[PDB]
């Protein structure tokens, strides 16, 4: 009858679509960390609209019975590069810290499911299953990752691509895509809230900090903001409820990473000014780092400028 | 009194691993005979780093 | 003698890539 | 691994449909108000109830052992008999009937009908057809008999009463309806849902101005245009100007769904430019705001600035 | 990602062959012939879409 | 005899969690107050309920057939639908959700959910995971998914009503929650609990003085310091002095948790030096006392004496 | 299903820790009662934090299937003494009354589970089980002991210890410890209240007696207080609500046993005085015995001095 | 502990910890040792001594002995089959550890003549006769770390 | 190099340094000109600065 | 299974040390 009140394994199958790759050329390839181009976990609730991420906000646990990551080229055979991929089952064993490029690749053809292939053909990177009965939780990665993520797909580039005339290409280039056929088994019916649905965004605004003041007159120091989520896309706007006498000028600039939209300023003489907006995504540890440019003469500041953060609750974000 | 085995036994191992990625010179960098070797990599078991051997 | 098997093997399989199939 | 195989995947669960309110003496005139909720029973006819998100990833469904509960939120000191039947021809519409007698009589003749007072609970079942017919999934595009095994009607037999037996007049929320399903899906895929951007992006460039009057004190209905039909927004104040007079404004919104916020302005030796309001936009490209205008600078100094920030998401 | 989640989809570069199959229902509905002039779910059993990623 | 063996030792019992109070119209604003009790379901998360003392002597537990009752303490003349679900990812936090609709909808989709009016009773079960995972015992040191098979939420669907169907405003205690468990422990040991002395010893040496004023009659707020942050104490009066005037004091405490006591003083041909007060100390090393000062000896004769007695036990 | 409503035997096992022993030397060893050094029952709810006392406030009955008391030395072999132990299954057969030392030891190597051993080696004293199905109650010993205690461990000293140079040691000395491996079976789920938990102490104070007055002028008589628990740790403080003319001096002193912290006095001339505090533990029969020192001249007293007792309810106490 | 960096996971099928003394029988101290398997609840937080010694023997694989003879303290395996990860912890510890060996001191030292020794000393050694099973072939990194420079000019001098 | 003006917020550049390194500066003087000299130089470094001269 | 033998064994053998032999 109905109202079962029972827990049962439900095995499912399908195929999906990960993100397209983006091979690096020459003007974006000078370090070990450029050889690594996609760091992408292989959990369930880690995508948008794939039939495995949307289908996992309705159970609570999972276990990849057998998975495989399938590469498909989008290039002619007349182009030349070479890339390898491996799935590490210890998501906090990070290759972020290796410096010499050769060591970075030798620790990839050691994991027990690694492959190697040109970017003009196809091959399946399989996932390898621990010898236990462990069940991993769905949802966003909250405190520790060894509960949630069952693997991490690291694809990384060996060579540098090049045209038919041998001239190494300078810009980026799309070299195919990744699809992930899967078979997994879920256990506990419920709903995780972290991938909320559209028509429920709220635009929270209740976090009001304050910029630290300088000590000297001219300075371009920096500042960091903690307590934010490990990953999101925020926006800042200024906020000012103070007074002044002479100038009290200041000009904060965007954080020192990729995302940047504009600038922001503060200026409190008769030609007063308070405007700007910066967009960014917080680093994986859950903070950010700004840089300031202060050029006022008063030293007894005693009035730290206030700011604001706001975000849209629409999904994992 | 503790002690352990005075036995020197050979153990044999098999496998493969990764060594280097070789780069090739062109015309500007190919001037002398020293810029014509492009990798020298010893073969001792302890020379690599990150290979399980 | 005293030899663990299959420590770190590798297997390679070649293929080809013609210019046209012309089915 | 790839299989290219099709299977059934029987599932189970429980859900929340909606709440229920009963009509009083005043709101009860004839059969159109006798009915009070006409809610289809399909898989993809809910706002995130684990089946309207889970019957998005299959095309075809077929219930097995569905059932609908009623859970009250009232004491035993009130009574209004009500009935409930799940019809299976979804084009059958009781609104056509006009005599209340026959309206209550084509309702309990259905198989899975139950009749009860709204002070206790009752389970209404779903009676499944005989053949092997599988119902499509998606919204109701043009015809309904492909995509609904059933609808759900909840009626209101003779009016409320009280401890001393008199009919009250005010409307009243009574209970809530739940659902306990077992269904068999087939054919993995995704049905579409219109979505024009699938990743966050902020539209932090829009700009406008608020005109102050040449009057000492008066409230207005300053309007904004050039927006989407219906969406969410949020205003943030700012200023890139000059002034040397005692200005003051503490404007406020005029909306019903979302008016949670405040704004302030103050421009002298001390400053105040804090606040935020967030609102819904009616389907005109329109929004009403009211001013305060408590400043002494009767002469127009310079109009202030505001900015919307539209989040480019699935749809606003 | 709604074009590959379908259970009988294939992906390929357009210089080699493939076979995209038709995945039959579990029930035994028979579809009618002729031009549709109606709702379409009587007179069709599938639709072949081809995309460009 | 010694065995050095590890076994399971399935046990059984029943317990008392806490009481429950429902929110009225005034205290009900949004989802944060919609929830009313967020109480973990672990073995070592209670104050002496036969499992928070009995899951101190094993490291690992695993429930089998737990279940949670609700027993009311109200008549049938009141109604407020409430639901209850035991979630199993303890990091799932409904406080994040803001729309009340989705808040009530991720709650009954859980397997072991029940929905009922708070005038009758209902049993909520615990649905045990599939694998062989055993949860540690102790307090929640840093992470929670090792040490909680489940939490317990109890919500409040639409507001209270009355015999004549109107929403009341005052807060109200409704019922009490009980628990009926069957669990399997393993690995005999003891988890620690901070304890600095494990046997009685009285600190009967502390001494102080109370200053009387040079005024005929006035009440003060004489304070004491040099104590522990939070503890229990008890005062006893005494006197080792002389006087030949009509003195009188009947001081009293100013506390909320423990003010059960009285003190008196009287020094003439008849004497009275009886009384005791016992109190809690706020987390300052602080305590407030008030005087009476009904004596005629305006001139300061000599301040009286008092003494605390701290019992050196596990922690005060 | 749950809510069983059934009684079931639950067999358990473990090891514990009794108290360390304290061998007597020469300045503390002249009687039969000095040869006996630990009189310690072998019930379950008779310790603090052992996993057998804390684990027995949650059932109601018990029965030692097999127990054994294990000795472990904490001394070198170069020291010389000799001690025996036995477990009497009749806890009200007391050796408190034997006078001659030899009889005290001959009635120990008669019980059917006695041992003898030097204090530099180890040996297990077992418990012996009656031939019945009897189940003993947990908790404090309330009225009669033959319900609660299944045995009593009497360890007692034969010789006098001595160093390597033969000089008999004068002070006490720690000669090891006792551990008690056990296997017991509990029956009825409940909670006994007598071992209350911390954060529930109350400091009761409602018992107000009065000292008997003398009949003569100078006297140092005594007085005893009944009605107290068989064992606890109390404290007294003075309490005075009376009048006087000339002197009415008095000085009570601590009871005549081990525990003593200070003194207490009474003096009611112009240089009035009322202060003091004594700590003690009541004897096993549940009373105490004080001694007084009165030195006043008035004979028509007619005003017995009052006192007070207070105690902390934290455990068995 | 170098050869475990070539496998993610492990599990001790067996273990034991010998005590190899160094003294004669003319020195005495009961010392008590055990292996706790919740490696977060620690004894350091206790502040008395009589409770510290009865949570150390209630553990099911504990032993007691004077420090002039041998013993074997075993490791008591779980009932479930959890595999623990290798490498330095950098995390919560209940993934990367299966136990912790604590060794206590219940009695004061004593000499040939029964008096207390004033100074500390070393008394022996501890072996570990183990068996273990590793699962997944790989190579964990090696933690390279370096702290930046920091100049310290906060002292005014005088001549 | 100082300016040729009475008062002027004169910028000043430094060269011959590493692409990244923790330097520190200290003052000294070796002569005078017998009038009122005064300068209170300050930095414009892209990380931080402790004080000034 | 897949187990190299005698990786790093140890063997211990006790003895005694009397106070006199008294041959
Ligand atoms: Ca790894
Ligand atoms: Ca690792
Ligand atoms: Ca019909
Ligand atoms: Ca019909
Ligand atoms: Ca469809
Ligand atoms: Ca036709
Ligand atoms: Ca959940
Ligand atoms: Ca969760
Ligand atoms: Ca006897
Ligand atoms: Ca432990
Ligand atoms: Ca623990």
mmCIF file of N, CA, C and O in Angstrom, chain F residues 100-146:
data_model
loop_
_atom_site.group_PDB
_atom_site.id
_atom_site.type_symbol
_atom_site.label_atom_id
_atom_site.label_comp_id
_atom_site.label_asym_id
_atom_site.label_seq_id
_atom_site.Cartn_x
_atom_site.Cartn_y
_atom_site.Cartn_z
ATOM 1 N N UNK F 100 7.947 30.501 3.023
ATOM 2 C CA UNK F 100 7.323 29.520 3.894
ATOM 3 C C UNK F 100 6.765 28.344 3.114
ATOM 4 O O UNK F 100 6.595 27.260 3.678
ATOM 5 N N UNK F 101 6.478 28.520 1.829
ATOM 6 C CA UNK F 101 5.887 27.440 1.052
ATOM 7 C C UNK F 101 6.882 26.306 0.863
ATOM 8 O O UNK F 101 6.591 25.151 1.187
ATOM 9 N N UNK F 102 8.070 26.622 0.351
ATOM 10 C CA UNK F 102 9.097 25.609 0.162
ATOM 11 C C UNK F 102 9.607 25.070 1.486
ATOM 12 O O UNK F 102 10.134 23.956 1.531
ATOM 13 N N UNK F 103 9.457 25.836 2.560
ATOM 14 C CA UNK F 103 9.889 25.384 3.874
ATOM 15 C C UNK F 103 9.033 24.224 4.357
ATOM 16 O O UNK F 103 9.537 23.297 4.998
ATOM 17 N N UNK F 104 7.742 24.255 4.049
ATOM 18 C CA UNK F 104 6.806 23.208 4.432
ATOM 19 C C UNK F 104 6.815 22.035 3.475
ATOM 20 O O UNK F 104 6.069 21.075 3.684
ATOM 21 N N UNK F 105 7.642 22.090 2.451
ATOM 22 C CA UNK F 105 7.571 21.201 1.314
ATOM 23 C C UNK F 105 8.807 20.339 1.164
ATOM 24 O O UNK F 105 8.724 19.264 0.572
ATOM 25 N N UNK F 106 9.946 20.791 1.680
ATOM 26 C CA UNK F 106 11.108 19.949 1.902
ATOM 27 C C UNK F 106 11.035 19.190 3.215
ATOM 28 O O UNK F 106 12.015 18.540 3.588
ATOM 29 N N UNK F 107 9.904 19.248 3.911
ATOM 30 C CA UNK F 107 9.734 18.669 5.231
ATOM 31 C C UNK F 107 8.934 17.384 5.204
ATOM 32 O O UNK F 107 9.288 16.424 5.890
ATOM 33 N N UNK F 108 7.864 17.354 4.424
ATOM 34 C CA UNK F 108 7.030 16.171 4.292
ATOM 35 C C UNK F 108 7.471 15.256 3.161
ATOM 36 O O UNK F 108 6.959 14.139 3.054
ATOM 37 N N UNK F 109 8.398 15.697 2.319
ATOM 38 C CA UNK F 109 8.981 14.827 1.315
ATOM 39 C C UNK F 109 9.960 13.837 1.910
ATOM 40 O O UNK F 109 10.230 12.804 1.292
ATOM 41 N N UNK F 110 10.501 14.134 3.084
ATOM 42 C CA UNK F 110 11.291 13.167 3.817
ATOM 43 C C UNK F 110 10.434 11.945 4.115
ATOM 44 O O UNK F 110 9.207 12.026 4.194
ATOM 45 N N UNK F 111 11.088 10.801 4.259
ATOM 46 C CA UNK F 111 10.390 9.529 4.353
ATOM 47 C C UNK F 111 9.601 9.481 5.648
ATOM 48 O O UNK F 111 8.371 9.365 5.644
ATOM 49 N N UNK F 112 10.311 9.557 6.762
ATOM 50 C CA UNK F 112 9.691 9.488 8.062
ATOM 51 C C UNK F 112 9.160 10.829 8.490
ATOM 52 O O UNK F 112 9.669 11.441 9.432
ATOM 53 N N UNK F 113 8.142 11.294 7.782
ATOM 54 C CA UNK F 113 7.429 12.508 8.123
ATOM 55 C C UNK F 113 6.002 12.165 8.496
ATOM 56 O O UNK F 113 5.404 11.229 7.958
ATOM 57 N N UNK F 114 5.470 12.936 9.428
ATOM 58 C CA UNK F 114 4.104 12.795 9.871
ATOM 59 C C UNK F 114 3.541 14.189 10.029
ATOM 60 O O UNK F 114 4.274 15.148 10.270
ATOM 61 N N UNK F 115 2.237 14.293 9.834
ATOM 62 C CA UNK F 115 1.530 15.556 9.832
ATOM 63 C C UNK F 115 0.274 15.380 10.662
ATOM 64 O O UNK F 115 -0.457 14.403 10.476
ATOM 65 N N UNK F 116 0.031 16.298 11.587
ATOM 66 C CA UNK F 116 -1.045 16.095 12.543
ATOM 67 C C UNK F 116 -1.378 17.411 13.223
ATOM 68 O O UNK F 116 -0.580 18.347 13.237
ATOM 69 N N UNK F 117 -2.582 17.466 13.775
ATOM 70 C CA UNK F 117 -3.014 18.558 14.630
ATOM 71 C C UNK F 117 -2.511 18.328 16.044
ATOM 72 O O UNK F 117 -2.413 17.192 16.503
ATOM 73 N N UNK F 118 -2.232 19.414 16.756
ATOM 74 C CA UNK F 118 -1.571 19.267 18.042
ATOM 75 C C UNK F 118 -2.535 18.984 19.182
ATOM 76 O O UNK F 118 -2.158 19.155 20.346
ATOM 77 N N UNK F 119 -3.748 18.526 18.881
ATOM 78 C CA UNK F 119 -4.676 18.029 19.881
ATOM 79 C C UNK F 119 -4.629 16.518 20.049
ATOM 80 O O UNK F 119 -5.230 16.006 20.999
ATOM 81 N N UNK F 120 -3.948 15.795 19.158
ATOM 82 C CA UNK F 120 -3.802 14.351 19.252
ATOM 83 C C UNK F 120 -2.331 13.983 19.097
ATOM 84 O O UNK F 120 -1.472 14.844 18.899
ATOM 85 N N UNK F 121 -2.053 12.687 19.171
ATOM 86 C CA UNK F 121 -0.702 12.151 19.223
ATOM 87 C C UNK F 121 -0.322 11.502 17.903
ATOM 88 O O UNK F 121 -1.168 11.208 17.056
ATOM 89 N N UNK F 122 0.981 11.272 17.742
ATOM 90 C CA UNK F 122 1.531 10.718 16.512
ATOM 91 C C UNK F 122 2.970 10.267 16.731
ATOM 92 O O UNK F 122 3.709 10.898 17.488
ATOM 93 N N UNK F 123 3.370 9.185 16.069
ATOM 94 C CA UNK F 123 4.709 8.626 16.179
ATOM 95 C C UNK F 123 5.481 8.922 14.905
ATOM 96 O O UNK F 123 5.044 8.549 13.813
ATOM 97 N N UNK F 124 6.620 9.582 15.049
ATOM 98 C CA UNK F 124 7.519 9.873 13.935
ATOM 99 C C UNK F 124 8.658 8.859 13.974
ATOM 100 O O UNK F 124 9.346 8.772 14.997
ATOM 101 N N UNK F 125 8.907 8.097 12.900
ATOM 102 C CA UNK F 125 10.022 7.147 12.927
ATOM 103 C C UNK F 125 11.356 7.696 12.460
ATOM 104 O O UNK F 125 11.471 8.841 12.020
ATOM 105 N N UNK F 126 12.368 6.838 12.548
ATOM 106 C CA UNK F 126 13.729 7.115 12.119
ATOM 107 C C UNK F 126 14.108 6.076 11.081
ATOM 108 O O UNK F 126 14.066 4.874 11.358
ATOM 109 N N UNK F 127 14.484 6.541 9.900
ATOM 110 C CA UNK F 127 14.756 5.679 8.761
ATOM 111 C C UNK F 127 16.260 5.492 8.674
ATOM 112 O O UNK F 127 17.002 6.459 8.466
ATOM 113 N N UNK F 128 16.712 4.265 8.830
ATOM 114 C CA UNK F 128 18.132 3.986 9.004
ATOM 115 C C UNK F 128 18.771 3.734 7.651
ATOM 116 O O UNK F 128 18.192 3.073 6.783
ATOM 117 N N UNK F 129 19.984 4.245 7.484
ATOM 118 C CA UNK F 129 20.699 4.109 6.235
ATOM 119 C C UNK F 129 21.015 2.646 5.964
ATOM 120 O O UNK F 129 20.814 1.762 6.799
ATOM 121 N N UNK F 130 21.515 2.402 4.762
ATOM 122 C CA UNK F 130 21.660 1.059 4.234
ATOM 123 C C UNK F 130 22.977 0.413 4.628
ATOM 124 O O UNK F 130 23.013 -0.781 4.943
ATOM 125 N N UNK F 131 24.058 1.180 4.621
ATOM 126 C CA UNK F 131 25.384 0.617 4.808
ATOM 127 C C UNK F 131 25.621 0.328 6.286
ATOM 128 O O UNK F 131 24.721 0.429 7.122
ATOM 129 N N UNK F 132 26.857 -0.039 6.614
ATOM 130 C CA UNK F 132 27.234 -0.512 7.936
ATOM 131 C C UNK F 132 27.929 0.561 8.760
ATOM 132 O O UNK F 132 28.821 0.255 9.555
ATOM 133 N N UNK F 133 27.528 1.815 8.595
ATOM 134 C CA UNK F 133 28.253 2.922 9.187
ATOM 135 C C UNK F 133 27.835 3.127 10.628
ATOM 136 O O UNK F 133 26.647 3.147 10.951
ATOM 137 N N UNK F 134 28.833 3.278 11.489
ATOM 138 C CA UNK F 134 28.656 3.442 12.918
ATOM 139 C C UNK F 134 29.107 4.830 13.327
ATOM 140 O O UNK F 134 30.197 5.270 12.954
ATOM 141 N N UNK F 135 28.271 5.505 14.097
ATOM 142 C CA UNK F 135 28.474 6.895 14.445
ATOM 143 C C UNK F 135 29.130 7.032 15.801
ATOM 144 O O UNK F 135 28.714 6.417 16.778
ATOM 145 N N UNK F 136 30.147 7.874 15.856
ATOM 146 C CA UNK F 136 30.926 8.048 17.059
ATOM 147 C C UNK F 136 30.080 8.657 18.162
ATOM 148 O O UNK F 136 28.963 9.127 17.948
ATOM 149 N N UNK F 137 30.639 8.636 19.362
ATOM 150 C CA UNK F 137 29.977 9.121 20.555
ATOM 151 C C UNK F 137 30.895 10.087 21.289
ATOM 152 O O UNK F 137 32.132 9.950 21.290
ATOM 153 N N UNK F 138 30.243 11.046 21.933
ATOM 154 C CA UNK F 138 30.831 12.241 22.473
ATOM 155 C C UNK F 138 30.018 13.448 22.075
ATOM 156 O O UNK F 138 28.988 13.348 21.410
ATOM 157 N N UNK F 139 30.488 14.611 22.504
ATOM 158 C CA UNK F 139 29.888 15.831 22.007
ATOM 159 C C UNK F 139 30.317 16.052 20.558
ATOM 160 O O UNK F 139 31.158 15.332 20.016
ATOM 161 N N UNK F 140 29.722 17.054 19.923
ATOM 162 C CA UNK F 140 30.109 17.419 18.561
ATOM 163 C C UNK F 140 31.385 18.251 18.626
ATOM 164 O O UNK F 140 31.348 19.461 18.854
ATOM 165 N N UNK F 141 32.530 17.597 18.443
ATOM 166 C CA UNK F 141 33.806 18.289 18.550
ATOM 167 C C UNK F 141 33.946 19.374 17.496
ATOM 168 O O UNK F 141 33.953 20.564 17.829
ATOM 169 N N UNK F 142 34.069 18.974 16.231
ATOM 170 C CA UNK F 142 34.194 19.927 15.132
ATOM 171 C C UNK F 142 33.271 19.640 13.959
ATOM 172 O O UNK F 142 32.745 20.586 13.367
ATOM 173 N N UNK F 143 33.059 18.372 13.608
ATOM 174 C CA UNK F 143 32.157 18.000 12.527
ATOM 175 C C UNK F 143 31.068 17.079 13.049
ATOM 176 O O UNK F 143 31.249 16.363 14.036
ATOM 177 N N UNK F 144 29.943 17.097 12.344
ATOM 178 C CA UNK F 144 28.693 16.588 12.864
ATOM 179 C C UNK F 144 28.253 15.304 12.176
ATOM 180 O O UNK F 144 27.525 14.511 12.783
ATOM 181 N N UNK F 145 28.665 15.071 10.934
ATOM 182 C CA UNK F 145 28.197 13.912 10.198
ATOM 183 C C UNK F 145 28.799 12.608 10.688
ATOM 184 O O UNK F 145 28.410 11.547 10.193
ATOM 185 N N UNK F 146 29.731 12.658 11.634
ATOM 186 C CA UNK F 146 30.199 11.455 12.300
ATOM 187 C C UNK F 146 29.328 11.066 13.480
ATOM 188 O O UNK F 146 29.291 9.889 13.848
#
